[PDB]
Amino acid sequence: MKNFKISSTYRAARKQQKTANRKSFYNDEGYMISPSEWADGVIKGLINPKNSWSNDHVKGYLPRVSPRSHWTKNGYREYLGIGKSRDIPEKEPEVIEMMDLELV
RNA sequence: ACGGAAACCUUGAUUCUAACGCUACUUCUAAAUAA
């Protein structure tokens, strides 16, 4: 993810709701396991330590993500997800079908 | 110059009539956490 970053409000919410202090651990099949067997499996190589845990849940429907910015050639700030992009949209696909009995 | 000679245990008769390999059932559910 380069077009976006973690929002500061979500980071603060995760910080002092203390969700990182209540991690859950999973094995290679994604089944919940205690930290002791997670450590055992990671040491023996039967678990990938990277993608095998979760940071509980942040309460409150907060947006996880904000747009990330960059510098233009003018030295101005600009969102990374906006720009020249491309140009191919056509108009639509008008499929006629002026006979369907539309229910009220 | 045999208690001997001549005599088919033979004739016809469907192991046949009726009966659903049948009943319910979406090749389908879950996307966390991190960035």
PDB file of C-alpha atoms (C1' of nucleotides) in Angstrom:
ATOM      1  CA  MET A   1       0.000   0.000   0.000  1.00  0.00           C
ATOM      2  CA  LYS A   2       1.623   3.190  -1.263  1.00  0.00           C
ATOM      3  CA  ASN A   3      -1.388   5.329  -2.210  1.00  0.00           C
ATOM      4  CA  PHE A   4      -2.591   5.410   1.395  1.00  0.00           C
ATOM      5  CA  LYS A   5      -1.325   5.484   4.977  1.00  0.00           C
ATOM      6  CA  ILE A   6      -2.633   4.588   8.418  1.00  0.00           C
ATOM      7  CA  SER A   7      -4.666   7.494   9.762  1.00  0.00           C
ATOM      8  CA  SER A   8      -3.513   9.274  12.901  1.00  0.00           C
ATOM      9  CA  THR A   9      -6.907   8.972  14.621  1.00  0.00           C
ATOM     10  CA  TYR A  10      -7.003   5.194  14.063  1.00  0.00           C
ATOM     11  CA  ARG A  11      -3.424   4.913  15.288  1.00  0.00           C
ATOM     12  CA  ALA A  12      -4.316   6.827  18.457  1.00  0.00           C
ATOM     13  CA  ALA A  13      -7.417   4.646  18.939  1.00  0.00           C
ATOM     14  CA  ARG A  14      -5.372   1.517  18.573  1.00  0.00           C
ATOM     15  CA  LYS A  15      -2.790   3.047  20.930  1.00  0.00           C
ATOM     16  CA  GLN A  16      -4.828   3.743  24.069  1.00  0.00           C
ATOM     17  CA  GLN A  17      -7.543   1.186  23.528  1.00  0.00           C
ATOM     18  CA  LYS A  18      -4.443  -1.055  23.895  1.00  0.00           C
ATOM     19  CA  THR A  19      -5.462  -3.520  21.160  1.00  0.00           C
ATOM     20  CA  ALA A  20      -1.818  -4.550  20.642  1.00  0.00           C
ATOM     21  CA  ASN A  21      -1.739  -5.921  24.210  1.00  0.00           C
ATOM     22  CA  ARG A  22      -4.477  -8.459  23.372  1.00  0.00           C
ATOM     23  CA  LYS A  23      -3.031 -10.191  20.325  1.00  0.00           C
ATOM     24  CA  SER A  24      -4.468 -13.459  19.044  1.00  0.00           C
ATOM     25  CA  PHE A  25      -2.236 -16.097  17.464  1.00  0.00           C
ATOM     26  CA  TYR A  26      -2.956 -18.623  14.720  1.00  0.00           C
ATOM     27  CA  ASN A  27      -1.237 -21.651  13.222  1.00  0.00           C
ATOM     28  CA  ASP A  28      -0.611 -22.319   9.531  1.00  0.00           C
ATOM     29  CA  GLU A  29      -4.259 -23.327   9.014  1.00  0.00           C
ATOM     30  CA  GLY A  30      -5.507 -20.160  10.706  1.00  0.00           C
ATOM     31  CA  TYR A  31      -6.803 -21.737  13.918  1.00  0.00           C
ATOM     32  CA  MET A  32      -6.517 -19.809  17.171  1.00  0.00           C
ATOM     33  CA  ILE A  33      -3.776 -21.000  19.427  1.00  0.00           C
ATOM     34  CA  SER A  34      -2.193 -19.896  22.728  1.00  0.00           C
ATOM     35  CA  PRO A  35       1.022 -17.772  22.629  1.00  0.00           C
ATOM     36  CA  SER A  36       3.035 -20.741  23.954  1.00  0.00           C
ATOM     37  CA  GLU A  37       2.139 -23.055  21.072  1.00  0.00           C
ATOM     38  CA  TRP A  38       2.493 -20.140  18.656  1.00  0.00           C
ATOM     39  CA  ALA A  39       6.060 -19.641  19.906  1.00  0.00           C
ATOM     40  CA  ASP A  40       6.687 -23.404  19.705  1.00  0.00           C
ATOM     41  CA  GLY A  41       5.439 -23.579  16.120  1.00  0.00           C
ATOM     42  CA  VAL A  42       7.361 -20.475  15.032  1.00  0.00           C
ATOM     43  CA  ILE A  43      10.568 -21.896  16.546  1.00  0.00           C
ATOM     44  CA  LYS A  44      10.123 -25.263  14.811  1.00  0.00           C
ATOM     45  CA  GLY A  45       9.178 -23.524  11.577  1.00  0.00           C
ATOM     46  CA  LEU A  46       5.581 -24.820  11.356  1.00  0.00           C
ATOM     47  CA  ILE A  47       4.192 -21.230  11.658  1.00  0.00           C
ATOM     48  CA  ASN A  48       5.177 -18.051   9.667  1.00  0.00           C
ATOM     49  CA  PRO A  49       5.697 -15.458  12.352  1.00  0.00           C
ATOM     50  CA  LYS A  50       4.726 -12.589  10.023  1.00  0.00           C
ATOM     51  CA  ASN A  51       1.133 -13.372   8.992  1.00  0.00           C
ATOM     52  CA  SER A  52       0.009 -15.319  12.042  1.00  0.00           C
ATOM     53  CA  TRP A  53      -1.401 -12.825  14.543  1.00  0.00           C
ATOM     54  CA  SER A  54      -4.027 -10.106  14.932  1.00  0.00           C
ATOM     55  CA  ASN A  55      -4.241  -6.870  16.938  1.00  0.00           C
ATOM     56  CA  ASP A  56      -7.691  -7.508  18.547  1.00  0.00           C
ATOM     57  CA  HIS A  57     -10.254  -4.936  17.314  1.00  0.00           C
ATOM     58  CA  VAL A  58     -10.528  -1.154  17.435  1.00  0.00           C
ATOM     59  CA  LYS A  59     -13.939  -0.040  18.585  1.00  0.00           C
ATOM     60  CA  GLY A  60     -15.932   2.717  16.940  1.00  0.00           C
ATOM     61  CA  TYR A  61     -16.148   2.476  13.111  1.00  0.00           C
ATOM     62  CA  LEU A  62     -13.130   4.673  12.652  1.00  0.00           C
ATOM     63  CA  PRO A  63     -11.581   4.958   9.180  1.00  0.00           C
ATOM     64  CA  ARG A  64      -8.408   2.881   9.210  1.00  0.00           C
ATOM     65  CA  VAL A  65      -6.756   4.724   6.345  1.00  0.00           C
ATOM     66  CA  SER A  66      -6.032   8.266   5.058  1.00  0.00           C
ATOM     67  CA  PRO A  67      -4.732   9.404   1.649  1.00  0.00           C
ATOM     68  CA  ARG A  68      -0.975   9.658   1.341  1.00  0.00           C
ATOM     69  CA  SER A  69       0.613  12.756  -0.125  1.00  0.00           C
ATOM     70  CA  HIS A  70       3.620  13.552  -2.326  1.00  0.00           C
ATOM     71  CA  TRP A  71       5.390  16.497  -3.925  1.00  0.00           C
ATOM     72  CA  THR A  72       4.768  17.690  -7.475  1.00  0.00           C
ATOM     73  CA  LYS A  73       7.437  19.199  -9.708  1.00  0.00           C
ATOM     74  CA  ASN A  74       6.237  22.660  -8.573  1.00  0.00           C
ATOM     75  CA  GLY A  75       7.081  21.768  -4.971  1.00  0.00           C
ATOM     76  CA  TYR A  76       3.399  21.602  -3.997  1.00  0.00           C
ATOM     77  CA  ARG A  77       1.649  18.852  -2.039  1.00  0.00           C
ATOM     78  CA  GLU A  78      -0.752  16.521  -3.815  1.00  0.00           C
ATOM     79  CA  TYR A  79      -2.674  13.341  -3.040  1.00  0.00           C
ATOM     80  CA  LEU A  80      -1.074  10.215  -4.517  1.00  0.00           C
ATOM     81  CA  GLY A  81      -4.337   8.771  -5.835  1.00  0.00           C
ATOM     82  CA  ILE A  82      -5.287  11.701  -8.104  1.00  0.00           C
ATOM     83  CA  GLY A  83      -3.780  12.682 -11.472  1.00  0.00           C
ATOM     84  CA  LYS A  84      -3.704  12.066 -15.235  1.00  0.00           C
ATOM     85  CA  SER A  85      -4.681   8.386 -14.680  1.00  0.00           C
ATOM     86  CA  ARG A  86      -6.017   7.368 -18.110  1.00  0.00           C
ATOM     87  CA  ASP A  87      -8.918   8.033 -20.506  1.00  0.00           C
ATOM     88  CA  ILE A  88     -11.158   5.077 -21.436  1.00  0.00           C
ATOM     89  CA  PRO A  89     -14.758   5.023 -20.224  1.00  0.00           C
ATOM     90  CA  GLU A  90     -17.029   4.828 -23.339  1.00  0.00           C
ATOM     91  CA  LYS A  91     -20.550   6.032 -22.505  1.00  0.00           C
ATOM     92  CA  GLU A  92     -22.699   3.046 -21.375  1.00  0.00           C
ATOM     93  CA  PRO A  93     -24.307  -0.150 -22.681  1.00  0.00           C
ATOM     94  CA  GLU A  94     -27.928   0.722 -23.494  1.00  0.00           C
ATOM     95  CA  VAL A  95     -29.545  -2.697 -23.880  1.00  0.00           C
ATOM     96  CA  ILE A  96     -33.063  -1.568 -24.968  1.00  0.00           C
ATOM     97  CA  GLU A  97     -35.281  -4.307 -23.452  1.00  0.00           C
ATOM     98  CA  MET A  98     -38.435  -2.194 -23.477  1.00  0.00           C
ATOM     99  CA  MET A  99     -40.662  -5.178 -22.708  1.00  0.00           C
ATOM    100  CA  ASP A 100     -39.769  -6.276 -19.149  1.00  0.00           C
ATOM    101  CA  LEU A 101     -42.852  -6.210 -16.937  1.00  0.00           C
ATOM    102  CA  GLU A 102     -41.368  -4.226 -14.053  1.00  0.00           C
ATOM    103  CA  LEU A 103     -43.059  -5.013 -10.742  1.00  0.00           C
ATOM    104  CA  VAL A 104     -44.287  -2.010  -8.768  1.00  0.00           C
TER     105      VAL A 104
ATOM    106  C1'   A B   1     -35.388-126.179 -28.960  1.00  0.00           C
ATOM    107  C1'   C B   2     -33.498-120.884 -22.368  1.00  0.00           C
ATOM    108  C1'   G B   3     -41.216-119.768 -17.808  1.00  0.00           C
ATOM    109  C1'   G B   4     -39.214-118.570 -23.233  1.00  0.00           C
ATOM    110  C1'   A B   5     -41.009-114.705 -28.026  1.00  0.00           C
ATOM    111  C1'   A B   6     -43.147-109.790 -29.056  1.00  0.00           C
ATOM    112  C1'   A B   7     -43.942-104.462 -25.313  1.00  0.00           C
ATOM    113  C1'   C B   8     -40.400 -96.796 -25.423  1.00  0.00           C
ATOM    114  C1'   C B   9     -42.805 -95.528 -18.142  1.00  0.00           C
ATOM    115  C1'   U B  10     -44.851 -92.807 -23.390  1.00  0.00           C
ATOM    116  C1'   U B  11     -48.753 -88.823 -24.604  1.00  0.00           C
ATOM    117  C1'   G B  12     -49.683 -83.299 -23.740  1.00  0.00           C
ATOM    118  C1'   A B  13     -48.236 -78.535 -19.615  1.00  0.00           C
ATOM    119  C1'   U B  14     -44.420 -70.985 -20.506  1.00  0.00           C
ATOM    120  C1'   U B  15     -41.525 -71.172 -12.948  1.00  0.00           C
ATOM    121  C1'   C B  16     -46.034 -67.515 -15.054  1.00  0.00           C
ATOM    122  C1'   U B  17     -49.198 -62.913 -13.091  1.00  0.00           C
ATOM    123  C1'   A B  18     -48.565 -57.373 -10.314  1.00  0.00           C
ATOM    124  C1'   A B  19     -44.272 -53.893  -8.887  1.00  0.00           C
ATOM    125  C1'   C B  20     -40.844 -46.356 -10.797  1.00  0.00           C
ATOM    126  C1'   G B  21     -33.918 -48.000  -7.426  1.00  0.00           C
ATOM    127  C1'   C B  22     -37.798 -43.947  -5.029  1.00  0.00           C
ATOM    128  C1'   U B  23     -37.740 -39.833  -1.090  1.00  0.00           C
ATOM    129  C1'   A B  24     -35.756 -34.325   0.940  1.00  0.00           C
ATOM    130  C1'   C B  25     -30.523 -31.570  -0.664  1.00  0.00           C
ATOM    131  C1'   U B  26     -28.078 -23.887  -4.320  1.00  0.00           C
ATOM    132  C1'   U B  27     -20.651 -27.080  -5.262  1.00  0.00           C
ATOM    133  C1'   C B  28     -21.303 -23.613  -1.074  1.00  0.00           C
ATOM    134  C1'   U B  29     -19.589 -20.445   3.781  1.00  0.00           C
ATOM    135  C1'   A B  30     -15.762 -17.389   6.358  1.00  0.00           C
ATOM    136  C1'   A B  31     -11.778 -11.976   4.895  1.00  0.00           C
ATOM    137  C1'   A B  32      -9.613 -10.841  10.631  1.00  0.00           C
ATOM    138  C1'   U B  33      -5.059  -8.102  11.631  1.00  0.00           C
ATOM    139  C1'   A B  34      -1.289  -5.347   9.631  1.00  0.00           C
ATOM    140  C1'   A B  35       0.435  -2.000   5.697  1.00  0.00           C
TER     141        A B  35
END
